Amino acid sequence: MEAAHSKSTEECLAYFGVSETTGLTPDQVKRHLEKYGHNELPAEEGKSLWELVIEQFEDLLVRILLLAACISFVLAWFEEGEETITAFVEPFVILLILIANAIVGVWQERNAENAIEALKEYEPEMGKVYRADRKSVQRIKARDIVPGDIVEVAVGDKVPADIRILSIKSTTLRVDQSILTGESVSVIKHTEPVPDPRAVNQDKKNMLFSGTNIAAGKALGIVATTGVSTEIGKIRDQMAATEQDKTPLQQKLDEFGEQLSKVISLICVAVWLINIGHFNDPVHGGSWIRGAIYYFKIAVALAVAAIPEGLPAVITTCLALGTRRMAKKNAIVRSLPSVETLGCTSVICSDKTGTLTTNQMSVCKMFIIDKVDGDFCSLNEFSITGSTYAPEGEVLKNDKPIRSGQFDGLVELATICALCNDSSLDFNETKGVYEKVGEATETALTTLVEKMNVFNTEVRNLSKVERANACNSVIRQLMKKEFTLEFSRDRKSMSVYCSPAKSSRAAVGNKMFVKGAPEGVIDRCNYVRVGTTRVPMTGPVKEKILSVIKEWGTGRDTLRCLALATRDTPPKREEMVLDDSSRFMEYETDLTFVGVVGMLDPPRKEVMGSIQLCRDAGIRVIMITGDNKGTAIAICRRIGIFGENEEVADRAYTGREFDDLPLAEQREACRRACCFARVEPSHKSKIVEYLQSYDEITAMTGDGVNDAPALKKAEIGIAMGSGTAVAKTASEMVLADDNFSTIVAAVEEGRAIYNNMKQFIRYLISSNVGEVVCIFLTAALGLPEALIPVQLLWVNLVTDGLPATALGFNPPDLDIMDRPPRSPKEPLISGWLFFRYMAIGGYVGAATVGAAAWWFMYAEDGPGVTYHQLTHFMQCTEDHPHFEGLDCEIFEAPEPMTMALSVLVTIEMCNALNSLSENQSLMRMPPWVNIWLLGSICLSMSLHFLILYVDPLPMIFKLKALDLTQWLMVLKISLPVIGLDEILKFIARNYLEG
């Protein structure tokens, strides 16, 4: 809908056939969506490259390798047996392979950039729009907005796309389009056209350019364009290409792609030397330089086979797929390069309120009397679940569920909780969460009655707005609150005067429900309600009550307690003066203690266990807060930062105590601290500084400009999703819920996104080192060659390239949080890991130069046989010493090389199955965990059988199809790799790390 600035509002509403009263419709959305794409700008420009030097090392090798195959046959294309066809088509083979190496190398290149696209649902404009389905506004993602739908914007909003204003709801509408125009002041917009189709944006006084924000006003409009069709979109697309610095894992990995290339470049250039003894020999046209181009091919080939390809792309996938994974968990990563650091987090600094704690008061404990006949009374203690103002949760006794209604004592406790209250619950259908109305401590009660629901009302069926104050209303339908006696610090309590509702009488049923702080309320109780009874307040009982009120108010939970009682025979309203707190303490006498409830601000979901997790992963959790030292210290023993009876007289500090210490004592405080209370805004940054001094990677939560500095200085800034825009742009990550338990998970995924890479690296390296050992172990202990040029190319393609990319789809490893956080100090590969590599690779290479050895040497019923004097085979000429029913041309036999190459491939897939997780079992994580692997394995295992059995080919590959016994061998020869590595894993899993 270009040039919408020159068209009537009608011409546009028409062009989209949308009614501005109800905006678009589902199918219109999907329709326009497909025709114009999502409201985003792509990455069509170059902003990424193949970090490794070797990727450009190999591509030159496969080019020059081909050259050798064009000089090879050419120099002398005529042999005694003209052209065997298995040395004539080689040029046609390698090239047929480089093509496969390509089709594959670009297969993984896509997934790598296909996953990037998966992460395009981050922190967008969230523009507002009107669609058919609903009548009220719709806060939808900026990208989900299609040209054509109806968008409205009020003060402060950011313009999500190019909008042709339709209606201006405010007396006027100024906008700030400073970012796109030479206009510093906000300008006005109007609802009419601007005929001239080629006028400049400054003169498009009726449009709202995307990426702009309105200074003042509200106004509806219709999206002309979106995406790159946007005025700001035609700009950013046409911008200067951006460059970047590099991360310590990239550096350490580039240093790695420098070690290998070199070594490789010598493991092979050492082959064109260990095989000098065969350059002249017959098999190679019986000339020198001709063999000097055959062993060249092998080396330049062995290289290609060893060069672990795919790393850059694969990482980018784990990375991508992982971030996707984090987001599902509310961890919106803003900087990919940072997720790298994320697993090196060694200290998290979090704020208490909202993040570690819910900040919604919740009753979690309550009791009442059970028995008292024997001058020794027991009680009925109940626990309550659910830690917010939402009606969700259930009453428990001895960790077991019970109906609140079955206990008559509770029915009154609720009646009090229900009536002696001035607060309520409200469902904010907008935010889809339960809100409180008034004081929290009261509201906490409200929610208790709901979780109680002593009268088994039907709730499930009700609407959220309905479940809000359900059970609470029932009680109000049975008891009329006449008047209330306001609070007062003299008696520290309050109460109400109630009487049966609808009851058309007086002086009957009247009761006064009193609620207050324990002591005082208990001392005004002369009677104590048991069952439905009421026995006088003896000396022993009153002791029992106060005893638990202590066990509760002091214990690890440190619950705030409230005493619930009723005045059975209240004075009459007449004889009562309600205009001074002075007399109220009096009317509130001769009470019958009903029960007590204990509330507290509960720790957010999982936070209690997440802290335990950090603990297992050596991460320091430091709580920053506004509380007082004492209460703050408490909250820490409540959540776990501190054991219930752990001495922490030096790991909690308050702003002032801290400023009072000397720099050297401040730095020390931080290497041990775990709680900070009443902190000046400038302490966070100071705290981090001291944290950095002990080389500690630190994640700091913030939520206001107040934290901007601290957020930036930290290794990882983490902004509250409920925070300010400033803090969000200062952090490298955002908490959608503002929950602490997230950070811990984000951190964990970091550990997996690393471990994934390590699975990928280990599989190539361990496997390829195994190839290089076969080519070597034959040329070593002297043996009939096991592989030739095109076979190396084959193996490469079948075990690098595809089942390799697969692993990038491996899932999150386990017991990944019991190690200390990674330090950018320690090396890419640990000495034991390298062993673990050679342990494997050294084996595979054996199994291969031990599969053909089984073909040549004895074999249950083998088609050929000889003895370990096979190491001298080349001197065979029927010399009459080691001769039998054998001919010197049996050392050219195809099946051996085929019993080999087939062992290689199958052994590697058996190995790729080991790359599902660094130190776990195939038992604890089956091969089917990652499907794409099983797939890629088969898709390759197949390309192998196809080369062996499809007659026009096994000839080119100098191979010769093996039978069911010849394949049952390959299995028992390669399958035992699982067995081995499964041991190394076992070891490490218990002996090494601990």
Query: Which residues belong to the active site?
Result: 351
| Cα R_g (the chain), whole angstroms | 39
Per-residue burial over 654-677, b if 16 or more Cβ lie within 10 Å, else e, is bbeebeeeeeeebbebbeebbbbb
Strands (E), 520-590: 525-528, 535-536, 560-567
Residues in the chain: 994
CA-to-CA distance for 265 and 990, rounded, in angstroms?
37
d(C-alpha 466, C-alpha 443), whole Å = 16
To Ca ion, the closest distance from the beta carbon of 695 in angstroms equals 5
> CA-CA distance, 746 to 740, in Å (whole number)?
10
Taking the C-alpha atoms of residue 821 and residue 619, their distance in angstroms, rounded to an integer, is 7
Angle at 136 between CA 134 and CA 137, to 5 degrees: 105
Any bridge partners for residue 561, and if so which?
A: 598
- Residue 397 has phi, psi (to 5 degrees) of -140, 120
CB 743 within 8 A of CB 759: no
307 binds, among Cl ion, Ca ion, none (CB under 5 to 8 A by kind): Ca ion
Cα–Cα distance for residue pair 876/881, rounded to 1 Å:
9
Q: How far, in Å, CA of 914 to CA of 517, rounded? A: 63
> Per the structure block, which two tokens stand in for 574?
């007449």
* CA distance to 151, 287, 756, 767, per residue, from 170 (Å): 15, 94, 55, 70
Cross-strand bridge partners of residue 158: 213
Residues 186-225 binding Cl ion (CB under 5 A) are 192-193
Site for Cl ion in 567-596 (CB under 5 A): none
- Identify what 799 binds: Cl ion, Ca ion, none; CB under 5 to 8 Å per kind: Ca ion
Residue set of the binding site: 304-305, 307, 309, 351, 353, 442, 489, 515, 560, 625-627, 678, 684, 703, 706, 768, 771, 796, 799-800, 908
Bridge partners for 700 per DSSP: 349, 717
Residues 189, 207: Cα–Cα separation, whole Å: 7
Backbone angles phi, psi at 297, to 5 degrees: -50, -45
Compute φ and ψ for 813, nearest 5 degrees: -60, 165
Interface with Cl ion (CB under 5 A), residue from 8, 477, 830, 990: 8
Question: Which residue ranges make up the site for Ca ion (CB under 5 A)?
Answer: 307, 695, 767-768, 796, 799-800
By CB under 5 A, residue 526 contacts Cl ion: no
Cβ pair 700, 567 in contact under 8 A: no
Phi first, then psi: what are they for 708, rounded to 5°? -35, -50
**Shortest Å distance, C-beta 192 to Cl ion:** 4
Whether 594 contacts 368, CB under 8 Å: yes
Contacts of 295 (CB under 8 A, 6+ apart): 271, 272, 275, 278, 279
From residue 657, give the alpha-carbon distance in Å to each of 628, 629, 661, 678, 680: 12, 10, 7, 10, 11
Q: What is the DSSP letter of 6?
A: G
**Dist CA 150 CA 540 (whole Å):** 72
> Which residue type occupies 169?
K
> How many C-beta neighbours within 10 Å does residue 490 have?
11
Contact 120, 143 (CB under 8 A): yes
Which residues does 112 contact at the CB level (< 8 Å), separation at least 6? 312, 313, 314, 316, 317, 320, 808
| Three-state DSSP state, 892 | coil
Q: If you ran DSSP here, which 8-state letter would residue 811 be given?
A: P
d(CA 206, CA 964): 78
The label of the residue with tokens 């309520």 reads 424
Residue 499's DSSP bridge partners are 480
CB 949 within 8 A of CB 967: no
Amino acid at 424: S
Q: How far apart are CA 58 and CA 37, in angstroms?
A: 38
